[PDB]
Amino acid sequence: MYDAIVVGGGFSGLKAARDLTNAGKKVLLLEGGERLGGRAYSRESRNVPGLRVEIGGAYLHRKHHPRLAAELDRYGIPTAAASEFTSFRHRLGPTAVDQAFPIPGSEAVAVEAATYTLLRDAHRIDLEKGLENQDLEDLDIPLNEYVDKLDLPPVSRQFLLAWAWNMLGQPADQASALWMLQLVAAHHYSILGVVLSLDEVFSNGSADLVDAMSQEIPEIRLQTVVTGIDQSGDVVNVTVKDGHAFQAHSVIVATPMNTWRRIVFTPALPERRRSVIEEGHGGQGLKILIHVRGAEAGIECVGDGIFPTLYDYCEVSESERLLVAFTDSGSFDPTDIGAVKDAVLYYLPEVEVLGIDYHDWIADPLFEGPWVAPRVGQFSRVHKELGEPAGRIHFVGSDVSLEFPGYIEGALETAECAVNAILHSHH
């Protein structure tokens, strides 16, 4: 039997397993898939042989992501500046300026005011308390409604909404304003930081870090899907799909929130958590890598398109590139290449689409979603609780971070808390 079983080998599970191991605990890591890294997933391009791409998480900022920065330094993992944007092709209307910050002077005063309002509202959020524990309900309303209250002129309005669509992976009428503001808060109470934290990337892919961490974890089982976690007895029994059971004093659930509903917990999880876990979060983010010809280097596009954003990803040749688009899978069907062409051409009418590459995270039974974003009304009811222990079962992951949810950094942060919890546990 083990001191701890860690379920899921994303960055959260990987950190927990590693750190517990180095603390002298006897750990088993169970991973359901054929690979480690989870929603961090570097692989060969489907479109361009020999070219390595990120199909999930990719971007970081040392200043905002200190835990991640520490991991990089720890293993000597090379990073690079994200591609500088030098050509701006927005669709924000005729008054927009083609720069990274496209707001014209005529809108300045409006933006000044909105900046105050947004930051004032964001400053209502204490990152330690949970979004359900702070009388924040008035903010937990559809983003479009909140933004309507800001009364923004057209450039700023559409610029805000575009990036919010990108960042939350939800259309404006499904996103929670409270959550937008959570993201602002996470970035040291900065709206600009939400986009400025797309700062650096893994020179050799996220798998570089994944592999470094896993080398420190002595016992890992791949292709092992946990189906039950039972703490009715003295020792936790973890049952597995086509497998013998495993047993441990403590269990760390480091699988995506939207998958928890597939595990049988005994006894049942605390009742306040149940409804949200059943429903899942509302995240529908969709990251599409687009192989193109005829695009100059360094393009950024933001506007009112079905792709709110479309921007440079990498040089393929002197004529070819990858761009990246963000949209959401409720709004957009990436199997419709005609739709992709239209979406691209809206911004870049000279460019030819050669192919696309993405992973349907929401259809993947090991995930059932991309990165976290709550449905309106969810997280002002229950949030901190989702990430709190139920007896000997801890719950970690980017999904449940109070501090940096939806980022690699949140994965690391949550793991830390669980590790500490366990090391300081009396049982």
Ligand X SMILES: Cc1cc2nc3c(=O)[nH]c(=O)nc-3n(C[C@H](O)[C@H](O)[C@H](O)COP(=O)(O)OP(=O)(O)OC[C@H]3O[C@@H](n4cnc5c(N)ncnc54)[C@H](O)[C@@H]3O)c2cc1C
Ligand Y SMILES: CCC/C=C/C/C=C/CCCCCCCC(=O)O[C@H](COC(=O)CCCCCCCCCCCCCC)COP(=O)(O)OCCN
Ligand Z SMILES: CN1CCC[C@@H]1c1ccc(O)nc1
Chain residues binding ligand Y by CB under 6 A are 97, 99-101, 103-105, 108, 111-112, 114-115, 156, 159-160, 163-164, 167, 180, 183, 191-192, 194-195
Strand partners, 44: 52
Tell me the residue number closest to ligand HNL, measured at CB: 371
Q: Which amino acid is at 315?
A: E
Q: How many residues does the chain have?
A: 427
Q: Which CB atom, from 280 or from 394, has the smaller least distance to ligand HNL?
A: 280
Residues 84-113 that bind a second copy (CB under 8 A): 100-101, 105, 108-109, 112-113
In angstroms, rounded to a whole number, what is the distance separating the alpha carbons of residues 416 and 396? 9
- Is 395 annotated as contributing to ligand binding? no
| Near ligand HNL by CB under 6 A: residue from 5, 17, 48, 167 | 167
Residue 198 tokens read as 């797309």
- Residue 361 as a binder of ligand HNL (CB under 6 A): the answer is no
**Closest CB to ligand Y among residues 148, 360:** 148
Rank residues 81 and 278 by Cβ distance to a second copy and give the closer one. 81
Please check if 326 is assigned to a binding site: yes
* Packing angle of the helix pair 11-22, 408-423 (nearest 10 deg): 30
358 is in an annotated binding site: no
- Is residue 308 a contact point for ligand X (CB under 6 A)? no
What 8-state DSSP symbol labels residue 107? G
199: contact with ligand Z by CB under 6 A: yes
Q: Check whether 408 is labelled as a binding-site residue.
A: yes
Q: Between 55 and 160, whose beta carbon lies closer to ligand Y?
A: 160
User: Could you say which of ligand Z, ligand HNL, a second copy, none residue 120 binds, taking C-beta under 5 to 8 angstroms by partner kind?
Assistant: a second copy
Q: What secondary structure does DSSP assign to 159-175, as a single string?
A: HHHHHHHHHHTS-TTTS
Sequence-ordered list of residues with C-beta below 8 angstroms from that of 192, at least 6 positions apart, any chain = none
Measured CA to CA, the distance from residue 92 to residue 158 in angstroms comes to: 6
Question: What DSSP letter does each residue of 269-295 carry, written as one string?
Answer: PPHHHHHHHHH-----EEEEEEEEESP
Return the residue of 348, 408, 419, 422 that touches ligand X, per CB under 6 A: 408
Integer Cα distance of 338 and 152 in angstroms: 33
Least CB distance to a second copy at residue 302 (A): 16
